[PDB]
Design a protein around this ligand. Structure first.
Ligand SMILES: Cc1cc2nc3c(=O)[nH]c(=O)nc-3n(C[C@H](O)[C@H](O)[C@H](O)COP(=O)(O)OP(=O)(O)OC[C@H]3O[C@@H](n4cnc5c(N)ncnc54)[C@H](O)[C@@H]3O)c2cc1C
Ligand SMILES: O=C(O)c1ccc2ccccc2n1
Ligand SMILES: O=C(O)c1ccc2ccccc2n1
Ligand SMILES: [Mg+2]
Lengths: 1195, 112, 56
């Protein structure tokens, strides 16, 4: 057996002094970055004057020189413009010109014209300069009909010709490299050069990478043939993206990148060498920068490439590492003797870098946050490059006339071709650089970055290329409200004279500050940072040497019991620790001890209980590396998932602490001893969340961890105790299900928090139903269980994004998330292409023991889990279903692994059981059957997570209004719900609620619920109002008043947006639960129950056995429509909760009958007739609404 | 300006539907659309599917999309005032069909 | 002002919508009240006219 973590993440090569200085700058505070850039960028007053004059002259020439003319000629609205361009786009998909012009004149002009508007967001940016994440296809359809009926064939013709020019000539230099080469001769004659960008990146499959490879190979031949020996400065070159050449281009896959991607780059470079053309490596996301340097190093040191100076490399000046990267490159050019071509750009991924750093909770951003800092960085890096023109060839890619002029004068009067050059984008940059190239202008050369590809390819990522925004230069030069004096303002002097040099942008939150004053965000760890990986390697190895133990930790001290070893599910030879399990006697003893200590813990003020949680959060944050290693080895998790789990534990602690500070006072009495039963799949996070909530609500806790994962739970309890939770308030009871049953059955147990299987949840519900609290009320149960989670994808979604989100949602954590994607639903027209991509992505996953950074998918938790999952796969295969599986390595035999698996089903009903493993089922649907599909998804009875990938607002509105799920996700993955941002919990067979990490949670753990923050609604249910009027007409005056009060008190209709990361909208809403079972005893009781259910938007099923049918005579039809009568509760379900009236004996008997009902576990509230009369909140309206979280990826 | 019930037929004067009443083929007014689809319309379309009334099921879905039910706009006006314009259901529509397919089409129009 | 607003409103609405397939009804009888004897008078007539209908 390999030693744990001995090969966790070894660097490609030992980190030199220069490489270390890059890494050290990765997230350096912006105030530390800017002062040396300002100094390096400083130029004389004479130069700054001359630069401003040159910049003014360039801008004046620009301002002295299509879609707008079309809009004005035909009086188009913006939506009509966008719709017209979408129509033109679709008309250009008809390849035969004759059939198209025919279709226009004969059919499309006549009126009746995959959505036409799939790419409308792109045309919206073209027409309006504004970007929307999704498309209002109904508005665009209306607009298209309007403009055609108003203007006919002539406007369709103009739109077609406009779109033809833009897509064939302006957005791309040519559709093919041959055509682009032909079209390049005109500007080449005038002194420009070219670098061709074969529109293509982010290989998803091996076949995709191979396709991009042979595209680059064929393009290099074509470019080299055309170059005809002009060399790397006068002649054309190519630009490549490393992410196009390998489907797993990342630091986590560094060995595969060096073994498989690097040889492909070398082969292409050898070809570019043969023709003596430039080959430029484009720069991508921040977490790929340093990895790409290892490839650049090997290439530049490879003697087979000697004699050629065409190797090029982009550096992004918006990145904090840029000057240190240049130091490294310049030195590498000296060591290798290769004059590396260095393209200095600002950077194209800014929005995404901000969002990624916030999501990952990292210390700071890897890019600047004020555009003016990037400009200073750019000029500062230009100075460094201009000092090194003997060993590198600087290529100053910019459209900013101020930037250009500064460098032009910085470079000085001495110039020769090959000293340096400028660069610009095809279409975009020619107006500026026709004022630069040529002896009549500034006599400096410019290389045109020339996109090459078809319309479909072009439309794939044209949005990002166009954002390159109110702060962008090309936007501001066309803004007549922006003067030239503004455009020529020297960013270096502006930054030098700001109050704090290099201050972060005011309106961008650091990751730690995402939640402002409410709470401190958990911090993550950057697994692309070599310092982090080196430090983590040691902390993880150290964690693997510790003799982890878990014992029964009672109020009186650790107890004796039977002891057994805890094993790594990825390698049973790897012993992780020892668990001493709890005897049933000591489990029952622990509950009595909790009961005896309950008043002393409840007497700790809420703020001090919250302070214990906050202190524990600090401790878990500090101990995260060690907690990571334990979770990795005990739970079989990857490092990335273990980081997220520790973050979630921290977030739960701080979130429930803040919620407590917002809500809890003396009248919110604790339930008493709470049994917290946690699962093995989140053995720290859910463990901590349930325990933290119960404790901070003032309840002592009996913590029963999953038998598979006791060690991390024992460490969680140790940390909570160190934080100040007394031993009598938090006891740890490791063991099997018999321990948990003993805890649940104990007479002093006042509540149960359970996360796990439906089977155990139903056993707990049945046991609790056998008893009542001393006050004669049901023992509260929070039970959260699995889901049959679906994702629906239509033909407007981006396949590559879908596939990434599906691979992650289905196979992350070996599919052992309650939120994991189980059923993918693909619209028929795109199903085969997405399935092909999905299967290719499947085979790029690395499955193995999780103490290696390169492992994507670890083991399943047990042999029994593995057998249960594989039995499902084999049954599907035996029924003839197509089954795709990754072949596992022989090393997996020492653990319990299931290969990620894709199973093609005929109908959603072919899947009949929860399969809690890495097994994705795929079904296909016709567009017209979308509504029936949503019916089919709802019909499973689950309602945990649901994903929708579409760009169409009409589809979003339809699906999200019809689907019944507690956590919705639009255009992103469906896993990893964030505490306080996507409160997590579903309906139906998926849980009782309230949602974990949401504002109703603590209220379930006290005997009188507080009013949560922001918890109210101005909407009054109309059927409630009708019922209140009916009650008054019946003479039931007190009940009418109670109904009116319930109508106001209900929070039905609450609709909030929760603070979170940029590029995402996180919504939280309160809806009706569904149909509530009403079991009244008296007429007044029935009226109160009806008022409570109706005020929260529900319908009801009233127990016919009550004999109260005569109490509802002459109901308004509106109320009658919500009222049914049930003689057989099991036959008339599913219900969504229950209200019960009776004495203690009657409540217990009803509670037992409800516990036996098939289907969902009902959240039951019971009260005596007297309690209904004395207590206006006998029934709590919190538990009669359903929480819905929706997370929309707006990036 | 204009009401319902005993107060008028509509469409409102000084509003975007007015001119369309005065031509034999109504145009699509500016901003006249909605992303909302009536759920009973959707249920009716599925029922049409189930009995094979394919032409009627298609008409039902198209009407579901064509309907501007749920339009919710703010109209330009003076400061210190919010002026809103919304499209709601009319109420109960009297259907006088002659044929079964005619009835399905009328029902689709009304439910949408 | 209201009469002016009707004229300009229906004029703009026409420019935004009416094309050759939006055929006129034909003669439209506009009957107007005494309480807004210019504004409603003008509004009904202007709408009918701009939609391509002669007005009584
Ligand atoms: C020929 C060419 C090739 C290129 N190749 C690449 C490449 O391989 N990889 C890559 O990442 N980029 C590349 N770029 C850069 C990118 O595509 C944009 O073109 C470029 O960033 C625009 O910069 P500017 O000087 O033209 O315009 P400007 O308006 O001067 O600069 C805009 C830039 O400022 C930066 N910025 C915007 N807002 C902020 C902010 N709030 N805080 C900090 N910085 C901000 C962004 O980088 C933005 O692009 C290339 C550009 C050109 C011209
Ligand atoms: O921790 C468990 O795995 C557990 C907890 C409580 C239980 C109650 C009844 C039956 C099984 C149980 N299993
Ligand atoms: O002692 C046990 O290990 C135990 C006891 C009861 C159980 C009920 C359902 C599932 C597992 C169980 N496991
Ligand atoms: Mg067991």
């Amino acid at each position: 057996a390999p030693a744990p973590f001995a090969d966790f993440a070894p660097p490609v090569r030992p980190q030199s002094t220069l490489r270390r200085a890059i890494t050290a700058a990765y997230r350096r505070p912006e105030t530390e970055c800017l002062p040396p850039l300002v100094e390096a960028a400083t130029q004389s007053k004479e130069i700054r004057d001359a630069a401003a004059s040159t910049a003014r002259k360039l801008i004046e020439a620009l301002r002295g020189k299509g879609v707008e003319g079309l809009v004005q000629e035909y009086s188009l609205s913006s939506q009509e413009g966008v719709a017209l361009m979408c129509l033109a786009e679709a008309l250009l998909r008809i390849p035969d010109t004759a059939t198209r012009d025919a279709l226009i004149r004969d059919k499309i002009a006549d009126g009746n014209w995959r959505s036409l508007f799939v790419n409308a967001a792109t045309w919206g940016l073209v027409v309006t300069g504004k970007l929307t994440s999704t498309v209002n296809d109904r508005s665009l359809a209306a607009a298209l009909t309007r403009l055609i009926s108003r203007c006919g064939e002539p406007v369709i013709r103009r739109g077609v010709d406009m779109a033809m020019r833009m897509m064939g000539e302006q957005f791309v230099t040519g559709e093919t490299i041959r055509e682009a080469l032909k079209r390049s001769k005109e500007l080449e004659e005038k002194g420009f050069s070219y670098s061709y960008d074969m529109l293509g990146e982010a290989a998803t499959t091996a076949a995709d990478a191979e396709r991009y490879y042979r595209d680059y190979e064929s393009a290099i031949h074509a470019i080299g043939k055309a170059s005809a020996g002009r060399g790397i400065y006068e002649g054309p070159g190519i630009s490549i993206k490393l992410s196009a050449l390998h489907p797993r281009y990342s630091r986590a896959q560094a060995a595969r990148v060096m073994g498989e991607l690097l040889p492909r780059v070398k082969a292409l470079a050898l070809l570019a060498k043969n023709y003596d053309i430039g080959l430029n490596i484009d720069a991508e996301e921040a977490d790929r920068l340093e990895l790409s340097l290892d490839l650049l190093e090997v290439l530049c040191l490879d003697g087979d490439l000697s004699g050629w100076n065409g190797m090029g490399f982009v550096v992004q000046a918006y990145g904090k590492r840029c000057p240190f990267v240049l130091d490294f490159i310049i030195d590498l050019a000296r060591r290798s003797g290769r004059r590396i071509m260095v393209r200095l750009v600002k950077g194209a991924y800014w929005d995404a870098e901000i969002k990624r750093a916030q999501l990952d909770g990292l210390a700071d951003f890897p890019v600047f946050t004020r555009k003016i800092h990037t400009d200073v960085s750019y000029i500062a890096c230009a100075a460094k490059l201009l000092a090194a023109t003997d060993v590198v060839f600087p290529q100053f890619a910019t459209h900013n006339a101020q930037t250009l002029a500064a460098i032009y004068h910085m470079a000085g009067k001495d110039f020769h071709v090959g000293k340096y050059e400028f660069q610009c984008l095809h279409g975009m940059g020619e107006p500026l650089y026709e004022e630069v190239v040529g002896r009549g202008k500034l006599d400096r050369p410019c290389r045109i970055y020339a996109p090459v590809g078809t319309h479909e390819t072009l439309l794939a990522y044209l949005v990002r290329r166009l954002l390159e925004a109110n702060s962008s230069f090309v936007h501001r030069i066309n803004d007549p409200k922006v003067s030239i004096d503004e455009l020529i303002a020297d960013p270096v002097e502006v930054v030098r004279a700001m109050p704090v040099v290099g201050a972060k942008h005011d309106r961008i939150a650091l990751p730690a500050e995402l939640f402002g004053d409410a709470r401190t965000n958990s911090a993550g760890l950057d697994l692309s940072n070599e310092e982090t990986l080196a430090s983590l390697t040691e902390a993880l190895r150290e964690s693997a040497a510790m003799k982890w133990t878990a014992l029964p930790q009672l109020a009186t001290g650790p107890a004796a019991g039977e002891t057994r070893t805890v094993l790594n599910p990825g390698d049973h030879r790897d012993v992780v620790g020892s668990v001493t399990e709890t005897s049933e006697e000591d489990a029952r003893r622990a509950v009595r001890l909790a009961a005896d200590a309950a008043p002393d813990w409840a007497a700790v003020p809420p703020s001090e209980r919250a302070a214990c949680l906050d202190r524990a959060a600090e401790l878990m944050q500090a101990r995260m590396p060690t907690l990571l290693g334990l979770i990795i080895r005990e739970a079989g998790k990857s490092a990335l998932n273990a980081i997220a789990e520790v973050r979630e534990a921290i977030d739960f602690l701080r979130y429930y602490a803040e919620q407590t500070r917002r809500t809890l006072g003396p009248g919110h009495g604790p339930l008493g001893p709470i049994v917290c039963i946690s699962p093995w799949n989140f053995p720290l996070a859910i463990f901590t969340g349930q325990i933290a909530a119960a404790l901070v609500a003032g309840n002592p806790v009996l913590a029963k961890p999953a038998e598979e994962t006791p060690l991390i739970a024992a460490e969680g309890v140790r940390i909570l105790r160190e934080a100040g939770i007394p031993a009598s308030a938090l006891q740890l009871l490791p063991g099997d299900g018999r321990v948990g049953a003993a805890l649940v059955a104990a007479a002093e147990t006042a509540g149960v928090m359970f996360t796990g299987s439906t089977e155990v949840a139903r056993l707990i519900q049945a046991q609790l139903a056998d008893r009542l609290s001393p006050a004669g009320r049901p023992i509260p149960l929070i039970a959260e269980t699995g889901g049959q989670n679906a994702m629906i994808v239509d033909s407007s979604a981006l396949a590559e994004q879908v596939v990434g989100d599906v691979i992650t949602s289905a196979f992350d954590s070996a599919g052992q998330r309650c939120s994991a994607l189980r059923v993918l639903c693909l619209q028929e027209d795109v199903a085969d292409r997405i399935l092909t991509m999905l299967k290719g992505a499947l085979h790029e996953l690395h499955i193995g023991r999780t103490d290696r950074l390169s492992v994507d998918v670890g083991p399943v938790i047990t042999s029994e889990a593995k057998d249960n999952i594989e039995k499902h796969i084999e049954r599907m295969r035996g029924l003839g279903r197509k089954v795709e599986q990754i072949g596992l390595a022989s090393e997996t035999g020492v653990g319990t692994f299931v290969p990620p698996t894709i199973i093609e089903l005929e109908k959603l009903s072919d899947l009949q059981r929860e399969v809690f493993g890495p097994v994705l089922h795929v079904i296909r649907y016709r567009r017209d059957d979308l509504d029936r599909l949503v019916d089919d998804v709802n019909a499973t009875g689950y309602g945990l997570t649901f994903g929708l990938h579409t760009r169409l607002d009409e589809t979003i509105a339809h699906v999200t209004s019809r689907i019944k799920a507690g956590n919705l996700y639009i255009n992103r993955n469906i896993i990893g719900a964030v505490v306080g941002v996507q409160p997590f919990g579903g309906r139906g067979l998926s849980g009782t609620g309230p949602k974990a990490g949401g504002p109703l949670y603590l209220g379930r753990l006290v005997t009188t619920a507080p009013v949560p923050p922001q918890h109210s609604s101005v909407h009054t249910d109309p059927v409630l109002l009708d019922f209140a009027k009916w009650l008054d007409g019946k003479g039931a005056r007190a009940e009418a008043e109670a109904a009116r009060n319930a109508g106001s008190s209900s929070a039905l209709g609450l609709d909030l947006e929760l603070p979170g990361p940029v590029g995402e909208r996180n919504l939280y809403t309160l809806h009706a639960r569904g149909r509530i079972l009403l079991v009244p005893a008296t007429e007044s009781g029935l009226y109160h129950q009806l008022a409570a259910a109706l005020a929260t938007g529900n319908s009801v099923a009233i127990d016919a056995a009550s004999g109260l049918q005569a109490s509802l005579k002459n109901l308004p039809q509106t109320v009658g429509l919500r009222v049914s009568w049930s003689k057989d509760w099991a036959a008339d379900g599913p219900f969504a909760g229950a209200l019960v009236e009776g004495d203690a004996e009657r409540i217990r008997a009803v509670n037992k009958a409800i516990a036996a009902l098939p289907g969902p576990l009902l959240l039951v509230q019971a009260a005596s007739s007297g309690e209904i009369a004395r207590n206006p909140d006998a029934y709590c309206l919190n538990w009669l609404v359903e929480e819905v979280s929706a997370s929309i990826n707006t990036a």
